[PDB]
Symmetry: D2
Subunit: 115 residues, 4 copies
């Protein structure tokens, strides 16, 4: 599992469940190409987005649909989404865990990168 | 001043100085159009990006060039940039302050919306 | 002004107003002694806690009464307070700004130390 | 496992390993009594601090020794430690995960509370 996403809700103190996540990879023409997508589980985790074979070097964007998450809870949030943009596997394959901590007017994101 | 940006460095405990900031507005063809840009001051602030007249309702993206900032300090960063995407809504008088707290592998962003 | 506190609310997207802040200094018997206190203003700021003469080197604790803040807004919080413990060191001229970003189940704190 | 701690390093993008963690419980005389302690694993996790039987209602403080962590990495940090103070099991037993995200001049803490 080379790319995992974990999302937490800072209002409720719980995993952020059923959150849509879209992953894009930058193409040679500098456009964002759809790469993978999914929804967070009951534990706020999203596994199996990609494979070691498919997850080649490149610039990737992980877009977390935080607006739909807050709207489903009756809260009008500030952000359209939480966007994490990074170069992956530049010095060989790595395993990436993207954490996102959500609040209506704020978000934090952290990456844990392991060899 | 309807839109201000303030950036802090969590490694040095200081304002993040000379950070490039680009503001885009979503156009009718769903592309991002350059709207305003600048560099943070010695206080980590960026003022005078736009005016009340120009800053109409719409979807905006504030891109903070965090990678160039960390590379200029000799620190290996994770993100290409910190991206804040939001809708500007006219619900009475408003001023937006986008705060960003930077670390090499993490960032947090909050919006302060006041009357 | 050698010590300032700024508090933001990540649920409402605003300064955290009328938040009680208590500053303590560690005494020789290892107990915490009251040093200064106040409440954040309409801008979420607390100025004039101490003076250059009084604010000597030592170990300080800044306790932010986050529980009373959330309870006054009808929101169920996790923390009793946000606690910032640090050593003040004379390494040339210095001003400390303690920033705190609040959510019901989370907080972040950063120090901005400038010359 | 009613109380778990997970610590991440925002500079290195990795779990914060071998970090000392001390847990205290507030006694009837309003003093902090030692309750449990340990060190984070290679995954930045600390399990087995307590048991369902021992972890009764009360006010608890989780003190994370962030200063020793940064000093072992040759970085002079701002904070003495990261302090998380909360009322536990007030409405019956809960499982608590305390996340801490560390930077030299900043920390964030979040709680995930499950029934
Ligand atoms: Cl409208
Ligand atoms: Cl000294």
């Amino acid at each position: 599992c080379p790319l995992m996403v974990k999302v937490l809700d800072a209002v409720r103190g719980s995993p952020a469940i059923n959150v849509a996540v879209h992953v894009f990879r930058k193409a040679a023409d500098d456009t964002w190409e759809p790469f993978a997508s999914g929804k967070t589980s009951e534990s706020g985790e999203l596994h199996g987005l990609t494979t070691e074979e498919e997850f080649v070097e490149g610039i990737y964007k992980v877009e977390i649909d935080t607006k739909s998450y807050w709207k489903a809870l009756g809260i009008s949030p500030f952000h359209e989404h939480a966007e994490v943009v990074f170069t992956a596997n530049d010095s060989g394959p790595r395993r990436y865990t993207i954490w996102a901590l959500l609040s209506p007017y704020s978000y934090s994101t952290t990456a844990v990168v392991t060899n």
